[PDB]
Design a binder for these strands. Structure first.
Length: 50
DNA sequence: CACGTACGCGCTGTCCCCCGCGTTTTAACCGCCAAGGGGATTACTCCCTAGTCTCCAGGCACGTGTCAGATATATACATCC
């Protein structure tokens, strides 16, 4: 979730390189995967159509 | 104003129950889904109903005459000394 407090807490960190380790990248819809790829690298990847 | 006595108040005992502290538990709090309904707005359409107007008539208020029940005498029969 991009709205949660953990998302804004970790997204405000001054880290050069990030990595996400999970088993299920997409669970409900493509908006969640959009949130993960926005947390990874913010802006060259956009998802706006469901 | 006088009297007198009952009760407010001060003192003492006593016991009991609440407070302080330490220890253990536990649920409030914060952060999370998971979808779905409730409700606040914005815009639009429609139609029923309440305001407005005119006219009229009877309900309410006032006044007054009467009328039936309650109260107070007028006279006659029964009764005590």
């Amino acid at each position: 979730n991009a709205e949660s407090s953990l998302y804004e807490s970790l997204n405000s960190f001054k880290v050069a390189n990030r990595m996400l380790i999970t088993g299920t990248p997409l669970q409900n819809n493509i908006k969640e995967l959009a949130a993960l790829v926005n947390f990874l690298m913010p802006g060259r990847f956009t998802i706006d159509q469901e």
